[PDB]
Write a protein that binds this ligand. Structure first.
Ligand code: NDF
Ligand code: NDF
Ligand code: MG
Ligand code: MG
Ligand code: MN
Ligand code: MN
Lengths: 307, 305
């Protein structure tokens, strides 16, 4: 037989499956009205991809060379890992850590040089919040979705990175409107209600550093006069899931979607996502704080049930 | 405690810290379609709009004008001895969930019975002429666009003050419009299911004898098997907290809906309903569009039983 909690989880999954809840990424060829977006996607916590939605001048123009020419060879913040897994699991001396990227400043031209050097470490630029570049985007074009959130973005992120930079599976407390400018992004998505199918562990936290001789290593993170820090993190690799180690993952129904230059992906709050991309892909995305209702509380309960 | 109980405690603590479903929002002006979808539908959040509707029917519609308009047609009416149609009642030391006595009656006789304080409790309930012109259903478009489909049911209700609707839930989005008088709702949010005691009761129906006496007649299925119904056990108006201490953690909401007011009652919200004498109301039921919230609620049902 099954335990009470197991039967309850089985009910949740069976009901979602029969009702096709979060069982696909809706695909649209035209931008919906704000009311359509609110009814069909925001209110249903349902992801959607709109093809060739944006005609921003950035799309088809922005490249690393174009950005160097447009903004000069200025110093930007860059993230570096030896393995391509910033905010990702990696082992050292027999111990598995959740590892943060090495963050540094370097000149855009040097970033371009290291992007052209796959014998070297994996790099990507990230910028969170430009008179030469604000002209190339029209944020108001996303109003059709923003009107469901009825608030300005918490954050606007710019990403430009190596094809080897993989973002391991996580979720965010934001509504995410994701716009690819150049190249393509590959998303693996898992709906929140399938949490019981996604194994999670508790891991010592580390950060990448380079030794005096240039070798990468993992430095554990410690608080002032105190012990090691820990992070809960998804432990499955959606590209190579170990179903012997994580049989429950066999019951997940991951969704795969490719977002091209000019496409918009609405990634709803608390959806698990794992992200890859083409080489020198460029993207911008908009994070809005979520509006709490009973789904968040049910998700917290689901967390308690799967601990 | 058990794992299930700790899970339910986590749920309730989170919802209480966020005050999910802690009040019925009050509007003095009909919102836009987009406002309604974003603030209320997508949040499974009730809302009452004051003096929203100016239909001719508001103010005019009373039993006398109705008799005039329909030529005293014979209507289907529900009768109970206690005023609790679809409600619990004891007979022979056993507690049944009782359906109403369903009969046919001239509107004039219904009006006469409503005026009898010593008589049984009557109410007219009619579910789908010159009356259609007294309404303007398109005025509810602001809500219908969130449902994106025509009403799956439209109900008319005219009733005695003693008719009380015991606490229950519906799998419908409900747009409730009071025509004459007022309705009093007690609401409990779905996520508080574990605070609402429910029991399994044998099904029964009210019937009158040859001498005019109400009794409870058991029901059965196709065979002679006894029929059962799950039903909320607590009386919100005077809850037995000794027998049902968990209900102390529920936080019911009281709202009075006057003539011209609109109440949006979201799907699966518990509601207990009273009304003023000869109250008239019309409501619109829309089948729900299943999302993850419904599946969470089905899980919650499995856990609390
Ligand atoms: O937009 C996101 O939430 C997200 O996970 N973006 C990732 C990169 C990223 C990683 C970490 C923080 C912000 C953004 C991507 O590969 O596009
Ligand atoms: O509209 C409802 O869902 C509802 O429970 N209405 C109650 C009575 C009722 C009971 C059953 C069917 C329709 C209406 C009222 O007093 O208006
Ligand atoms: Mg794995
Ligand atoms: Mg009681
Ligand atoms: Mn993310
Ligand atoms: Mn009801």
């Amino acid at each position: 037989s099954m335990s009470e909690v197991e039967r309850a989880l089985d009910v949740l999954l069976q009901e979602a499956e029969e009702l096709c809840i979060g069982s696909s990424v809706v695909e649209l060829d035209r931008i919906p009205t704000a009311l359509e977006f609110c009814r069909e996607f925001y209110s249903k916590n349902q992801p959607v991809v709109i093809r060739k939605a944006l005609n921003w001048p950035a799309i088809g123009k922005w490249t690393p060379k174009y950005l160097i020419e447009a903004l000069g060879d200025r110093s930007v913040d860059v993230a570096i890992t030896p393995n391509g897994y910033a905010d990702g699991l990696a082992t050292q001396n027999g111990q598995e850590y959740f590892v943060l990227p090495l963050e540094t400043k370097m000149k855009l031209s040097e970033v371009v040089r290291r992007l052209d050097d796959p014998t070297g470490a994996v790099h990507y630029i990230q910028k969170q919040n430009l008179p030469e570049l604000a002209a190339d985007l029209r944020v108001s074009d996303l109003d059709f979705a923003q009107q469901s959130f009825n608030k300005p973005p918490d954050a606007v992120n710019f990403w430009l990175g190596d094809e080897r930079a993989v973002t391991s599976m996580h979720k965010d407390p934001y509504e995410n409107v994701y716009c690819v400018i150049s190249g393509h992004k590959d998303f693996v998505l898992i709906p929140p209600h399938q949490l019981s199918c996604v194994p999670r562990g508790i891991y010592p936290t580390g950060v990448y550093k380079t030794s005096d001789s240039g070798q990468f290593y993992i430095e554990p993170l410690r608080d002032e006069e105190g012990s090691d820090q820990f992070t809960e993190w998804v432990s499955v690799d959606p590209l190579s899931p170990d179903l012997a180690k994580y049989p429950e993952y066999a019951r997940a129904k991951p969704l795969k979607v490719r977002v091209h230059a000019g496409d918009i992906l609405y990634l709803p709050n608390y959806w698990f996502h794992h992200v890859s991309q083409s080489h020198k892909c460029i993207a911008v995305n908009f994070w809005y704080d979520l509006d709490y209702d009973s789904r968040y509380c049910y998700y917290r309960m689901l967390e308690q049930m799967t601990s």
